[PDB]
Write a protein that binds this ligand. Sequence first.
Ligand code: NA
Ligand code: NA
Ligand SMILES: [Zn+2]
Ligand SMILES: [Zn+2]
Ligand SMILES: [Zn+2]
Ligand SMILES: [Zn+2]
Ligand SMILES: [Zn+2]
Ligand SMILES: [Zn+2]
Ligand SMILES: [Zn+2]
Ligand SMILES: [Zn+2]
Ligand SMILES: [Zn+2]
Ligand SMILES: [Zn+2]
Lengths: 285, 277
Amino acid sequence: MPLVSMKEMLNKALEGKYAVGQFNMNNLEWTQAILAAAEEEKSPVILGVSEGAARHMTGFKTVVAMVKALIEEMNITVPVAIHLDHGSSFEKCKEAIDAGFTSVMIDASHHPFEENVETTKKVVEYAHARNVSVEAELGTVGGQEDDVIAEGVIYADPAECKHLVEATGIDCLAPALGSVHGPYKGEPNLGFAEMEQVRDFTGVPLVLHGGTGIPTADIEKAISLGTSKINVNTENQIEFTKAVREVLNKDQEVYDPRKFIGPGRDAIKATVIGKIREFGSNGKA
Amino acid sequence: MPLVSMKEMLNKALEGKYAVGQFNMNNLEWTQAILAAAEEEKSPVILGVSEGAARHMTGFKTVVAMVKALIEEMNITVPVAIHLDHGSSFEKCKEAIDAGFTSVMIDASHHPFEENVETTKKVVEYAHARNVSVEAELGTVGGGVIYADPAECKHLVEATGIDCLAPALGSVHGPYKGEPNLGFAEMEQVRDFTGVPLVLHGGTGIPTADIEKAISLGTSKINVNTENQIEFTKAVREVLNKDQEVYDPRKFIGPGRDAIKATVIGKIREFGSNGKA
Ligand code: NA
Ligand code: NA
Ligand SMILES: [Zn+2]
Ligand SMILES: [Zn+2]
Ligand SMILES: [Zn+2]
Ligand SMILES: [Zn+2]
Ligand SMILES: [Zn+2]
Ligand SMILES: [Zn+2]
Ligand SMILES: [Zn+2]
Ligand SMILES: [Zn+2]
Ligand SMILES: [Zn+2]
Ligand SMILES: [Zn+2]
């Protein structure tokens, strides 16, 4: 079975009022976990790859080679996309595409609107010609940075959302509305009113970043307001490392890596299964 | 620049009186570290894959895809072999070969001699028809040690045409209880009786002098695994212990990978294959 873009799975999800989880890939065991979770739950799944993570894994080509081999050899039957997360530029998106990515996000939300539109439109030209899905962003997703206002959150402007989607033809849009990458300082403060307006006026699947720490009620609400893709990364790292700590603290002698990395991989699998069910994509393959 | 079998690199080591290290692969970061070490040292390298490690990494096909992609994308220019370590059966060696392994070890040393010979011959015929190098074994590596018999070595090499031979002569997988007691006189006989490169198993914990002495007695391939696991985990422990809060895996896997890289470099230099690429 071959890889697919995110087009079909996200449209099906929007119509079905559930979301497809993107879970970020970090290495080989991370990927086995995510795919195993998706297979067991009979759910579509998106493998997110940041440029940083791609470097950790040598590059886009190693990433694609490894995913393809795993799909074949694990017998994965469910829809899988490989999506470049927070693509820096046209050139990065093109490289990921040529390497065999089936989806890319061009994130130019930190640039002036008109530059964002221009860059994004260009990425879309190249991607759609190759049956690659595209995500873009408006507003700023929060983070763990120092000396920022409100964790660095800047709400998307629904009017710009409308214009950018109309001008570029992206397949999905991330309107940053309170998402923070990594843990939230307090309870997330998601702009559901703004989201409702972005849903009204774009008509495309929306993407909700910074999934770790967003309580179930906010997840259901976001989905009910047009969110069809939700990204989780931090939570997998947290659970992976908790399981690795447990093993290393209880047995001070062990050095066989699979004795601590295995339980960590299992922890990730169970974490992804939980989020899959929470998002409503189980049985939707 | 594709993967090669072990034939050329081991014959060069034998003539050059040095050894090529086999370093066992356990995952993606493990492979990156081994390849980076070899490339930096301009040294041939052998990537070892046990059947258990193959499974941990899903399978033989995933192993090959990963290595081939890393080779191209890291710009690896030195000789690299992928070697099924302790192949348990003809069928396992066939599967590895079919997946694109360039080298296999059929280990039937724990069966009667004539069965070992017969099985090994079967693997050699399949492998050599595909330019795949073959290792076989006599005697038992500790994990209890049993010395290979030099006459059986002569006969097995002659009957099979294997490219290299592991005469178990004191090797122990993992840490040695005391200090190794290698059968150097036995090894010399095997060297002389066979004329093929010999393989030293259980390199972790074999002191420098024993290594240099094994090489002078015809050892051209030296397997190392445990020491990489020890250094990797040691580096992980240091990070997790000093920082009770960190959860980002690259923060501890990263230094684990560095530790392995440094360990392989040291072993490559000790084995003498730096600059032999
Ligand atoms: Na978050
Ligand atoms: Na050893
Ligand atoms: Zn890294
Ligand atoms: Zn930018
Ligand atoms: Zn415009
Ligand atoms: Zn994000
Ligand atoms: Zn948790
Ligand atoms: Zn395993
Ligand atoms: Zn038998
Ligand atoms: Zn036994
Ligand atoms: Zn002598
Ligand atoms: Zn061995």
